[PDB]
Structure formats: structure tokens, C-alpha cells
Design a protein around this ligand. Sequence first.
Ligand SMILES: O=C(O)[C@H]1O[C@@H](Oc2cc(O)cc(/C=C/c3ccc(O)cc3)c2)[C@H](O)[C@@H](O)[C@@H]1O
Ligand SMILES: O=C(O)[C@H]1O[C@@H](Oc2cc(O)cc(/C=C/c3ccc(O)cc3)c2)[C@H](O)[C@@H](O)[C@@H]1O
Lengths: 115, 116, 116, 115
Amino acid sequence: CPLMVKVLDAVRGSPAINVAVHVFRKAADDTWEPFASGKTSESGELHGLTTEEEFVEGIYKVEIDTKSYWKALGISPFHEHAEVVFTANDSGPRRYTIAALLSPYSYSTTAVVTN
Amino acid sequence: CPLMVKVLDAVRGSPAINVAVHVFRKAADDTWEPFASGKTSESGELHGLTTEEEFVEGIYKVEIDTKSYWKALGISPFHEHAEVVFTANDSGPRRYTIAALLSPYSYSTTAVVTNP
Amino acid sequence: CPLMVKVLDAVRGSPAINVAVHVFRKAADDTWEPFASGKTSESGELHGLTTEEEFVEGIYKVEIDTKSYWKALGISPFHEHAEVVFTANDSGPRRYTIAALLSPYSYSTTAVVTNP
Amino acid sequence: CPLMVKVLDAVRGSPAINVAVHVFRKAADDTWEPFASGKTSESGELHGLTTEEEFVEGIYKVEIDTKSYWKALGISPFHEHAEVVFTANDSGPRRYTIAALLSPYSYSTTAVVTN
Ligand SMILES: O=C(O)[C@H]1O[C@@H](Oc2cc(O)cc(/C=C/c3ccc(O)cc3)c2)[C@H](O)[C@@H](O)[C@@H]1O
Ligand SMILES: O=C(O)[C@H]1O[C@@H](Oc2cc(O)cc(/C=C/c3ccc(O)cc3)c2)[C@H](O)[C@@H](O)[C@@H]1O
């Protein structure tokens, strides 16, 4: 599992559950091609997006659909989505975790890249 | 000034200086049209991107060129750019400050929205 | 103004208003002596805590009373207060801005340190 | 394990390893009594601090020794330590995770409280 996503809710102090996540890969023509998607689990995690074989070097975009999350909780949020855009590099460690901490008017995202 | 950007560097404890910022607006055909651009000052602020008249309702993307910023400092960061996407002015005109706190493998962003 | 505090509310996208702030300084005997206190303005800023003369070298604790802030808004938060502890002025006088971004189960804080 | 700590490094994009963590409980006289301590693991985590039986309601302080962490990496940091002060409440979910994301001049901490 070379790419995982973890999403946390800073208002409730919980994992952010049932958040839609869409991953795209940047194509040669510089458009964003759908790559993988899913919804976060009860633990705020989304595993199984891709495989080592398919996750080649390139630029990827992870879009986290924060607006729908907040609206489902009855809260009015600022963003349309949270977006994380990065280059996958083979010279780095093998596993990418993209973590995001959500608030209605803010977020904070880090990458944890490990062997 | 209805849209302003503030960027801080969490490594050095300073304003993030000379950070390029490109703003796009979603057009009727659903693509991202270039809207305004600039770079942060010595105070990490970017003023004067647009005007009240031009900043109409829509969906805007503020791309903060964090990779270019880190590379110019000779460091290899993780993200390409921090993107902030939001609907603006859909309850009338507001003033928006988009703030970002940058580290090489992480960034934070928040919005401060005021009603003049 | 060598020590200033800025607090933002990540729930409402606004300055955090009327947030109490207590600053302590570690005394020679190792306890936390009260140093200055104030509350944030309508802009979420707190100026005038101290002076250049009084703000000598030392270890300072800035306690931001986030629980009191959230409770006054009728919400039940997780932390008691955000504490920011740092050595100041140990390479000569500097100006410090302590910024904090608050949510009920989370907060961020960064420092901006400038040399006049 | 009612209390866990997770520490991440926002400069390196990694877990923060071998970070000292000290937990205190606020005593009746309002002093801070040592309660539990340890160093984060290779995954940036510290488990086994306490037990359900010992972790009673009260105010706790988790001090993360960030200054030593940064200095060991050759980096000059701003803070003496990161401090997380909170009330443990039995009406809430059973497990507290205190997460912290470190930079030299900044940090960000959340609580994930789950069943
Ligand atoms: O199940 C697991 O292995 C772990 O899940 C962990 O949850 C995570 C996992 C992860 O890869 C990253 C985070 C990141 C927290 C974070 C905190 C602040 C911020 O600005 C951004 C992110 C939390 C729990 O914190 C830990 O307590 C548990 O053990
Ligand atoms: O628009 C607003 O109401 C306010 O936003 C403010 O934006 C700032 C300015 C500043 O000096 C620091 C900050 C700190 C932002 C911050 C962002 C992310 C984080 O994790 C921690 C702090 C924000 C402007 O300083 C103020 O002039 C304006 O008024």
C-alpha cells in the first residue's frame, strides 16, 4: 500500500469518517486523470487506493471532499475541498501517508513518507 | 482590498517572502481561468490582487507556489503548491484573507472572512 | 511592542475575540512568575503586554485561555489552554509575535521573530 | 491503552523518533505530579503510558521535549517544549490520542478521542 490517506476532525476530536477522497494523476497534456478513489473508514483512513506497480513517479492530486463532510454534520464550511498536490519519487521512502486535519475554515496537511 | 494572502515560514519563524501566488476563477465552461497573481512582500503579505468590482461571485482557487518558494531557498519540499479553493461572495461582498503556514512536508491554511 | 499575540478561530473564520492571555517568566528559583496579561481585541490581537526594558532575557510561557474562550461561546473544548514556552532575547532584543489558530480539539501555534 | 501520543516531523516528513514525552497529573495543591513518561518509537508513537485503572478523571499535561529533538537534528528551534493540557473525562470516548506535528518555529496538536 504505497499511498494512504488519514483524515481527522478538529471540531469533534475524532476521525473524519465517510469522507470522499479522489486521487488524480497528471497526464502528459497537463490534465488531471482519475486514478483512485474511496471513502474514509471509521478510523478516518483510506487504504487500498493503489498498488506499487501502478503508483509510478509523477505528480498526483489528492482531493478530499471536505465541503460535503461538513454539510453532512450541519456545519457551513469555507472550502470546496482540500487538495494535496505532490510528486511521487522513487528515491524517497516507499510509503506515502497524506494526513489532513479539518476545521470548517481551515486545514492542515502533512506527508509522512516511510519505509 | 477584498482578497489578501499572508504566508509564514514555520522553519525560520518569519514571513515567507517572495512567494508566488496565482488565483484562478472557475468559468462558465468549468475550467480554471487565470484571475490575478502576485508575490508576497517582506512582510509575507500580498495585497492588490483584485478589486471589489472585479471580485464577483464565483469559485476561486488560490495557488500558493510553495515548491517554487522552497526551491529558491535551495530545499526539496514535498508539495507542488498549496491550493485553496472556495466559493466567494455568494452572500454579498466579503473580504477574504487566506493565510498559510509552510513547512517542507506540511502546510496549514485558514481563511478569515469579514463583512465590511 | 516586543511581544504580541494573534489568535484566529478556525470554526468561524474570524479573529478570536476577547481571548485571555497570561504570560509568565521563569524566576531564579524555577517557578513561573506572573509577567503580563491581557485579552485579544476585535482583531484577535493583543498588544501592549510589555516593554523593551521589562522584557529581558528569560524563559517565558504564554498561556492562551482557549477553554475560557470556548466556554464563553457555550462550547465544550478539549484543552485547558494553549501554552507557548520559549527562551526570549538570548541573542539580544527581538520582537515576538505568537500566533495561534484554534479549533475545539486542536490548535496550531507559530512564532514570528524579528530583529528591529 | 487509554492514552497514546503520536509525534510527526513536518520538516522531514517522517515520524518524530526518540522524542521524550512526560505526562503529569495536576494534584490537589495545583502542582504537576509526574505520572508517566517515555520516548517515541520508530513510528513516532508512544504507547503503554498508563492503564485504564490509573487514568482517572483529572487534568493532565503532556510535555513533548521538542527542543532536544530539533537540536539532535542540528536545527535551532523556538520552543522549549510543546505542552498539551487537558481534562480526562469519563463521559467521553475511552481512548485519547494526542497527536503533534512539529516544525522548528511552530506546532499543531489535536486530540483524537475514540471508542
Ligand atoms: O492506528 C494507528 O497506527 C495510529 O493512528 C494515528 O492517527 C494518525 C496517523 C497518522 O499517519 C497521522 C496522524 C496525523 C495527525 C496530524 C496532527 C496535526 C496536523 O496539523 C496534521 C496531522 C494521525 C493515531 O494518531 C495513533 O494514535 C494510532 O495508533
Ligand atoms: O483578516 C483578518 O481579520 C486578519 O487576518 C490576519 O492574517 C494573519 C496575520 C498574521 O500576522 C498571522 C496570521 C497567523 C496565521 C496562522 C495560519 C495557520 C496556523 O496554523 C497558525 C497561524 C494570520 C491579518 O494579520 C490581519 O491584519 C487581518 O485582519
